[PDB]
Amino acid sequence: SGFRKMAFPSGKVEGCMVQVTCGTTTLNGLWLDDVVYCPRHVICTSEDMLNPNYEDLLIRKSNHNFLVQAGNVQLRVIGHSMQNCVLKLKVDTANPKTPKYKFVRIQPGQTFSVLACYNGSPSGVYQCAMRPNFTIKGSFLNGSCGSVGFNIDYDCVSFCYMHHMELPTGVHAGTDLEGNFYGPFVDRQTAQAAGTDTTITVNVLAWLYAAVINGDRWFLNRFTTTLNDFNLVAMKYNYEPLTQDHVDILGPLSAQTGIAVLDMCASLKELLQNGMNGRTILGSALLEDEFTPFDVVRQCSGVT
Amino acid sequence: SGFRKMAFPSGKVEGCMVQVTCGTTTLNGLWLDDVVYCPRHVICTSEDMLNPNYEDLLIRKSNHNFLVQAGNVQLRVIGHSMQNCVLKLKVDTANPKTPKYKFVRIQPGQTFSVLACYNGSPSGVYQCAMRPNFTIKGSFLNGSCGSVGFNIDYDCVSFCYMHHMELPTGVHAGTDLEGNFYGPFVDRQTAQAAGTDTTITVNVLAWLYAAVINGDRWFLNRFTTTLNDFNLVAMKYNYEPLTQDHVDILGPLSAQTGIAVLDMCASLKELLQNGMNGRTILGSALLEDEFTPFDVVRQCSGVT
Ligand SMILES: *CC(=O)NNC(=O)c1cc2c(s1)CCCC2
Numbered sequence: 001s002g003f004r005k006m007a008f009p010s011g012k013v014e015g016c017m018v019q020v021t022c023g024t025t026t027l028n029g030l031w032l033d034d035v036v037y038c039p040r041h042v043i044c045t046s047e048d049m050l051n052p053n054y055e056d057l058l059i060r061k062s063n064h065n066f067l068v069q070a071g072n073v074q075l076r077v078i079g080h081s082m083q084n085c086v087l088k089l090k091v092d093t094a095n096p097k098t099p100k101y102k103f104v105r106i107q108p109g110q111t112f113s114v115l116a117c118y119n120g121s122p123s124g125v126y127q128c129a130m131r132p133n134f135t136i137k138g139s140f141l142n143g144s145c146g147s148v149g150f151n152i153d154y155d156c157v158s159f160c161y162m163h164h165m166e167l168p169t170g171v172h173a174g175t176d177l178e179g180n181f182y183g184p185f186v187d188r189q190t191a192q193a194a195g196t197d198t199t200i201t202v203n204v205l206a207w208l209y210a211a212v213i214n215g216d217r218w219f220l221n222r223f224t225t226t227l228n229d230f231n232l233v234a235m236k237y238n239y240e241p242l243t244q245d246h247v248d249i250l251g252p253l254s255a256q257t258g259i260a261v262l263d264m265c266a267s268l269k270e271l272l273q274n275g276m277n278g279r280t281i282l283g284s285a286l287l288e289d290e291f292t293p294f295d296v297v298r299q300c301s302g303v304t
Numbered sequence: 305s306g307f308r309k310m311a312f313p314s315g316k317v318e319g320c321m322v323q324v325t326c327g328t329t330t331l332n333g334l335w336l337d338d339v340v341y342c343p344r345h346v347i348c349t350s351e352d353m354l355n356p357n358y359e360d361l362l363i364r365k366s367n368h369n370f371l372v373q374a375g376n377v378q379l380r381v382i383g384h385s386m387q388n389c390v391l392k393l394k395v396d397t398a399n400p401k402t403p404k405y406k407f408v409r410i411q412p413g414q415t416f417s418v419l420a421c422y423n424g425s426p427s428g429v430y431q432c433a434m435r436p437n438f439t440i441k442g443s444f445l446n447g448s449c450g451s452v453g454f455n456i457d458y459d460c461v462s463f464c465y466m467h468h469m470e471l472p473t474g475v476h477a478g479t480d481l482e483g484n485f486y487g488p489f490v491d492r493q494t495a496q497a498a499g500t501d502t503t504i505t506v507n508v509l510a511w512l513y514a515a516v517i518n519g520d521r522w523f524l525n526r527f528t529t530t531l532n533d534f535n536l537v538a539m540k541y542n543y544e545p546l547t548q549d550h551v552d553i554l555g556p557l558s559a560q561t562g563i564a565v566l567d568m569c570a571s572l573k574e575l576l577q578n579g580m581n582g583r584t585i586l587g588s589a590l591l592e593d594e595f596t597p598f599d600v601v602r603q604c605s606g607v608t
């Protein structure tokens with residue numbers, strides 16, 4: 001029993017973090033096989049950040065300008081290329097700690113673990129979601145860029161995020177491991193406003209299921225509703241619209257708890273309309289939307 | 305910017321988790337040097353849990369009854385002994401992944417990372433506090449016993465918790481790595497009620513400092529108070545009494561933010577008396593008490 005915002009074990013990723021230094025800019029890189037992946041803005045001065053021409057900046061850089069340190073051992077760079085907003089540094093040594101891995105571009109609402117790093121050294125691990133406005137609500141200081149988000153399926157690490165940006169509102173933007181930004185964000189010091197941060201409705205319902213499973217049931221009511229009725233209420237409260245897909249994904253939690261998805265929707269509807277009245281659900285005073293249905297099954301069934 | 309419930313990287317501990325099986329009971333052990341540490345109730349049947357005589361139960365067990373598997377490789381047990389509520393299994397192989405480590409018994413209010421494990425395999429990592437009633441609010445399923453709580457100071461893992469028990473209220477009890485229970489709990493299937501779960505006042509103030517640093521300041525007020533006045537309000541709300549020690553520990557956060565501890569106390573007092581009025585602080589609708597002042601400094605200064 002008990003339900004916790006749980007990250008994946010970070011060991012497999014700890015073994016991949018290196019320090020990349022280009023002139024006086026240092027940040028984190030990801031060493032997989034004989035490639036080190038890092039934010040292309042490693043080649044920039046903070047001066048450069050205002051309107052950088054990465055193609056032109058990169059012409060001035062050679063393999064030997066890219067200082068890659070793995071713990072205390074320097075890697076030899078035999079190749080460099082820019083893919084979207086990441087650099088790939090070919091090194092002469094395969095990372096002996098390369099786990100089985102994939103690069104996956106995630107959908108908004110999907111959750112992942114971040115290994116926050118500074119100077120290629122891990123400081124901590126926390127769980128995130130890709131917000132519907134393609135920001136993440138991270139914990140990132142200067143030097144944190146190149147820290148990666150990931151999922152683990154048994155022994156395979158799926159890398160989904162590399163950290164690049166803080167927006168002036170203190171939220172986080174970055175890329176998949178192909179260096180394509182989530183959302184409309186660019187690696188440039190400019191006016192970039194986040195859109196509406198909407199609640200991930202399907203994740204809230206998942207977390208309502210997790211609560212019932214762990215004995216928090218005060219919010220279960222006598223009512224039901226319909227997808228269309230529920231969605232009218234969701235619109236009003238800047239909740240994502242709930243689809244039949246979301247209902248299907250909640251099927252197993254529905255089945256295990258014996259509470260129909262649309263009944264749980266009617267519970268959520270009442271919580272939106274009436275608030276929590278100073279009560280709590282799994283030790284939270286607001287509706288948690290950063291557990292997926294997959295996350296709830298996993299944590300409730302002890303998948304390793 | 306951004307503030308997150310952050311665990312330590314779990315890699316150094318992942319390398320220490322093994323599976324211990326005694327007859328038909330399996331749980332997790334901690335392999336450090338040539339010793340595997342595990343809950344002594346590994347020797348019990350669930351029948352046994354009602355009123356176990358561990359000394360008598362253990363007389364019936366030999367080294368070869370303790371099946372220790374490290375990933376997929378069996379360790380040879382050359383010795384076993386009971387220290388308080390843990391077993392120490394001497395194995396013929398030093399764990400090659402033994403990090404620098406210590407066993408430390410923590411104080412209530414102190415925070416640590418849990419690597420939740422099943423069958424000696426990591427499933428996840430989350431941050432905890434030792435509650436003032438010596439419970440932790442964990443996420444633990446059957447087979448999770450032997451999962452450990454820890455802190456990391458640069459390269460040294462201080463093990464502070466081994467998981468043993470769920471109380472009938474779904475909260476968690478366990479031991480330091482000498483096998484002494486935190487609080488009055490025994491490894492026995494019996495009436496064990498937790499005492500008052502009081503709020504860790506000094507941690508809440510630390511988290512109020514973390515909020516100001518990260519731009520959440522709506523709750524900063526025009527008032528101040530005194531240790532004695534504040535404590536009258538703390539009593540009423542089942543907050544731990546605030547000592548001059550707590551004030552001293554908050555000194556650096558005080559200094560960095562330029563908000564005197566007693567002014568922040570007067571802010572906390574108003575929040576207790578008036579609630580949050582539907583507002584949030586670092587994305588939480590209640591007062592978080594599972595960051596220490598040390599945790600806030602660390603996360604705000606990017607210590608690795
Ligand atoms: C993000 C990090 O830890 N290292 N690099 C930086 O500090 C910057 C990244 C960007 C900046 S400054 C300006 C906007 C574009 C990305």
Ligand SMILES: *CC(=O)NNC(=O)c1cc2c(s1)CCCC2
Nearest residue numbers: 353446447448449468491492493
């Ligand atoms: C805790 C775990 O994952 N493995 N062991 C158990 O399930 C039990 C531990 C205790 C039980 S059952 C009864 C109370 C005493 C501790």
